[PDB]
Amino acid sequence: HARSTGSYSLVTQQPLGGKAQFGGQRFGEMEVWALEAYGAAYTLQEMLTVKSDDVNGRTKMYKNIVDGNHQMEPGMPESFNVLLKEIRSLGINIELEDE
Amino acid sequence: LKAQTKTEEFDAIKIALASPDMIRSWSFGEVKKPETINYRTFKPERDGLFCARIFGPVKDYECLCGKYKRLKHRGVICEKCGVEVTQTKVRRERMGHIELASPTAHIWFLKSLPSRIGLLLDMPLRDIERVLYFESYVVIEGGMTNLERQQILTEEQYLDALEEFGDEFDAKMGAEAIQALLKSMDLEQECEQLREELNETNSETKRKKLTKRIKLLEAFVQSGNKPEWMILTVLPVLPPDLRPLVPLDGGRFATSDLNDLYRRVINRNNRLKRLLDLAAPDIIVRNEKRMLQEAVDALLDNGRRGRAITGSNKRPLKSLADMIKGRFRQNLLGKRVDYSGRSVITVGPYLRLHQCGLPKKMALELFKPFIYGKLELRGLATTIKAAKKMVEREEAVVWDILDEVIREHPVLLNRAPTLHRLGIQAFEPVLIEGKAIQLHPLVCAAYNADFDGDQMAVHVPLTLEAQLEARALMMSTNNILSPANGEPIIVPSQDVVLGLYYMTRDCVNAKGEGMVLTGPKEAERLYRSGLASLHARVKVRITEYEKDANGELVAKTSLKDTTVGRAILWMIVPKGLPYSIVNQALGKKAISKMLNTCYRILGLKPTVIFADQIMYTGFAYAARSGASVGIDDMVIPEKKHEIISEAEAEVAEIQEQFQSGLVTAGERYNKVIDIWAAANDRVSKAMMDNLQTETVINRDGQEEKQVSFNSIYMMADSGARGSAAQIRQLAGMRGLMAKPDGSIIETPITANFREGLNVLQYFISTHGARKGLADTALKTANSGYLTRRLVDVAQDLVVTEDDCGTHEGIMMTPVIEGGDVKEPLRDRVLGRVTAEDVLKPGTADILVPRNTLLHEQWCDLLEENSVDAVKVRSVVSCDTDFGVCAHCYGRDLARGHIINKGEAIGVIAAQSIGEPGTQLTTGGLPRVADLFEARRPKEPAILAEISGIVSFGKETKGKRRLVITPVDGSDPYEEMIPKWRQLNVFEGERVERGDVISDGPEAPHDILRLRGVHAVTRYIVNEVQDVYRLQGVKINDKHIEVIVRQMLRKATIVNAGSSDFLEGEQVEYSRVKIANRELEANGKVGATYSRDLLGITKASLATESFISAASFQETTRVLTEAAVAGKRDELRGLKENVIVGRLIPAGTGYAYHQDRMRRRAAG
Amino acid sequence: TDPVRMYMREMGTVELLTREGEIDIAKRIEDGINQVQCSVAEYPEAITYLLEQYDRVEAEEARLSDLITGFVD
Amino acid sequence: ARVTVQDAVEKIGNRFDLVLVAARRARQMQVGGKDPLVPEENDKTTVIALREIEEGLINNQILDVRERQEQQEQEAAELQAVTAIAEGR
Amino acid sequence: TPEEKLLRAIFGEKASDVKDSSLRVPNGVSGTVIDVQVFTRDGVEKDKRA
Amino acid sequence: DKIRKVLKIAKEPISMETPIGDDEDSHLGDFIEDTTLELPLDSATTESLRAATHDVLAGLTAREAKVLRMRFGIDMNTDYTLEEVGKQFDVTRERIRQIEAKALRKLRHPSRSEVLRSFLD
């Protein structure tokens, strides 16, 4: 199996795999430690931002790849952005501070 | 400078209570109807749980009514339906709210184990609930009458107490009461009460609970939160697309369970709002209020009441709280990733070390966006739309383009259980035909990859950084040493070490015996021409090099006494190595130390290109060898049946003694097992005597015997495959088996695999096999749960400071276990940096001066002299607050130099410990957990508490007291000792504090307390290492020592003058503040403390960042207990920075956080 | 706890009505509503406004359904 | 230089700051800012930046010196234009 | 979009009300067709090949 | 025939948190893909069809752009009825219809079309 860019799930903007290019590889907690044990800070960020949950960066990436600029403009994963609204839709006020 | 308003780069995250005013800021309308969609048109009913007025348009830039469909109209609200025309995405962002009729208690603050609403009031839960369901009144600011504030009344009592005091006395019931209680409550005033009460009454039962409550209370005032806010007046609703109502095929619908939960709250709230305008009897509205309370509770956290079930379906409904979990460690289970793939992996021995075979097809799909760009960048495609149609057509030219994008572009490879950092390594891709992934055979050892069906996954480093990160950090050839023990993880495995062992071998009389050859080149010429045999004693002129000069290769040429094979192998050995390194027999043992020395002498590159040539030549000559395995290769000794009958005789006599009552049944079973155990040892080293040497050959004369050249012997002697324990099961008899309950069966398996086993033997062989598969299956689980507990206590630990600057360090010796040296000194001390100058057997003479990194030269300069002990700086002593100085840590890495700033030694320590965890066996892997968890043993020994002469006091009262009496100081120490446990202290001897008063195991908690931090850290490492060193597992003490640093992360204060008296806290925070007190502030009001040993999971429980804690701990309690404190998470750490999707505060990201933490708290 | 119990328990204290007590309450209900009706009838603005609203019914500014539903007989 | 990075880490001691400096240089070439400082054996901008470290002619200090130089070259071109923003007076 | 409509007026293609949803052979696999079955809901007229 | 339409909506919607029965305890909702989304392999070409038509429109006479970008929605709010474009340009109506036709005509010859045509498939 392989997959560059494919389909994505509605609730969690994460790679789901139906028709055409299949589902992506799961990159679990233990694989994350590997990158942490290396210095792979960027390899990790792009692995859990632009390459998966970042609904905006993922296409700012695909456009930048074909443009010939190997940059990522990150942004925030949807998993955490949903957790804002999930915590916030309990009685809990959770904010992002400073500047 | 201007402040700011909008959106820049956020740092930190604050959590708090939400005022009802706060909750309405998020809402863009009140949901008023339980309606969802319309039912014929699947449009959203306005003022419903799904709505376009409140949340957003259904499709992009289209008003709901339709009068404003054009993308021109944007910030416009249609005059009919209160809908602005933006993206459908805002149905994923915009929240709503509901105005509650009656106040409603927040289940989390009412019911999370320590009731916040409870102890904020100092009110019990069975009382608050009794007030909440309208069963009994509670007083509120009862004033100067007959009743206290928190007093609780019944119906009749409230009536009797009302007739006496009409006003000037207030009592309510229901949520309005508890809301008033928290509202009227004054925190600062109650603070002044708890402070005077602490000082007036001296009692350990009084001021032990007193201090425990007040720390939350004044944390609550300082929090900014308001106590009224735990009673909900407004309930915010989650955006709809996060609980959507999408259609499926066949026209059937699916929706999140919240909609059943949200619908019910609305219905009961609306019904209650009706029951008030109908002015219903209180009996009804009370029941309605109770249901609204129940409905909200099942929405926020279903499960803490009677657990409502979903519509028509038996399963319960997944509440908001369960949206967050979904039990433990539920936000960090993993995320699927773009630009990835997997397939079955196969060999490919032709590969250089830094590359891997990638299928033509996988590499096509994986780099698709690179190909699309590189295609029209050169102009082979007009535009991207045709570029797709090209690589869809697989035109011949896209293949030649794919090589262009592929060249300097590494890929990542990952195998299933990712144990240590080597489980993901970056290789340079080689375009290969077929659907298999080709894996370099030397990197197999790191991955634990067989080729029996195992698969690996691939990942594309997209950004420029990740490509350089993959190239400089994760590359195959940049990690050739294990980070668990500075030895090479890229050892020749099996097929290859058989080859070299076959080369570097010699037989007594072979073709070429005795000729003299000008150089190694003519030695290969002699073999490939069929003139000289690969193994024949032969003198050859060789030149070797040695860099004994100041960095320069001195050459030396001689006629060395070797063989033809070892001559040809010398053509591979690079430059400054001695010819002695190949002059021997070269088994897997000697073949890896050959590789190690090349790295420590010549450096990285010449080692990488070496390992390749060792594999190429190893494979080739192993294939030339024709080594096989036939049935006649497993030689059974001729004396086997003899040994069996002899032990078969002894047992018949031990039985003879048992019949006559000479020996016991327990002795018989024990004595019979011993003669069978001996017989197996006898057959064993009988077949190995025959097998190993019986090759009797002849050179010019009569006879002469040597190590055998039989196939299966060479496999073991070399170390390629096979082990003497396993071989013994083929020729000799195979052991005694264990019957299920744990006994070992008194008649062993006399037969072996070269013969047959019979029904009975095989049937008994079964239990060992099945419990083998189960034990090895379970101990693969226990390990994985260990490395979790281990990274959870570490993770955030990073080499931060350069040199903390200390002379503190642990005294390093060889372990010398009873008999002789179970571990040399040179191993324990290599790669560490010395605490102070080490001296010769005589002094005035520094041999290594102060903090120098003891490497191989220094270790020999140590091993030349008779130095038997070296004080070494250790992580447990590194005085860096928040992290570890590079010096005190050591050097180890997959690279050979001292640790670099920013590496996340916390993880790579934990990994190195739990990776070999599969291979262990009180003792075994739980014995490791017992130590790291600091678990006290069942029946401990007690240690001498204080120095002085000891004596016994009182008599037997269940406890026999012991009174120690120091020479100078106070003597009031008396310890209650159960005197039915045999003691060891001499009853008239002066005892030194920390000595054996009884015997048996000891608690680490004592060791730290009595003998000190340096003794407990020694006790752990030597005791866990005994588990690993028993199983033949090399783990440097370094890694165990960083875990220990986390175990004693905390301390308890003894004296005061600044903060509390007994609190437990980090030495990092404490030491940072009593160092702040030796100058500045007070002259020295500083406090003394006492280091506290925590088990890893207890030590991991204490994390500042609540986002980290909400990962693995119980997410409800962390979120509640943090939201009441108004706690700020500053990020800073590892776990949370992953959760929020930004650069790790380590590695390449360490430079980023260091540039960020400094701009913060500055201008 | 669980509201079913405490509702069941709360109303179980209420005693069933005798077949005569049903009339006692319906009589007290009669008095109260009739009492306010006698008080509504004493208010001049209540007379003028009912006349204000009927001068709205005869000018086709409403319907007879919007003001009354019937008289006695 | 493509087989291992050890020769480069010698010139900048961190192994981590090497990935950050060599990446910062790789952008200067890929996003067509600059031309190489060493002959390119087809090597991508990933490696060419790494060759420039082993050759010793590029590091974070040398880059910042050249950049702070370019701040003043483009400032002297825009010079006679931005002083014409004496309309704020 | 604007630009796509300009593309519709230049090369004059009657923009379809219909989307391509054909069953197509999965990528990579290849073989021979050896059977076709058609099950038509009762009431729909059995098509030609059916 | 309404029975079918009736029978469709009579089924209550399905718990999206239904366990689907895998070994990962996958829930139903984890499998419903986002069909409202534009795939990056498409949005990439949208950013390319942009630069395509912009280059092809600078190959026209200057007032052919302002008359074409006005007839379609390109780089302006809304599209303009060709009469509305006529009021902007003094000489009105039929005059504009030929400016419209001739601009598509200069772009239809295989020299300016070679780039644009490959957006049709």
Ligand SMILES: Nc1ncnc2c1ncn2[C@@H]1OC(COP(=O)(O)OP(=O)(O)O)=C(OP(=O)(O)OP(=O)(O)O)C1=O
């Ligand atoms: N990171 C990985 N490294 C090596 N092997 C992997 C990896 N991931 C999956 N596999 C193999 O792929 C399937 C399971 O995949 P998944 O767990 O269901 O997840 P996803 O559906 O998203 O692919 C198994 O292989 P097999 O089915 O052949 O059977 P096996 O487990 O006994 O080897 C796995 O070994």
Ligand SMILES: [Mg+2]
């Ligand atoms: Mg295998």
Ligand SMILES: [Zn+2]
């Ligand atoms: Zn509208």
Ligand SMILES: [Zn+2]
């Ligand atoms: Zn230190």
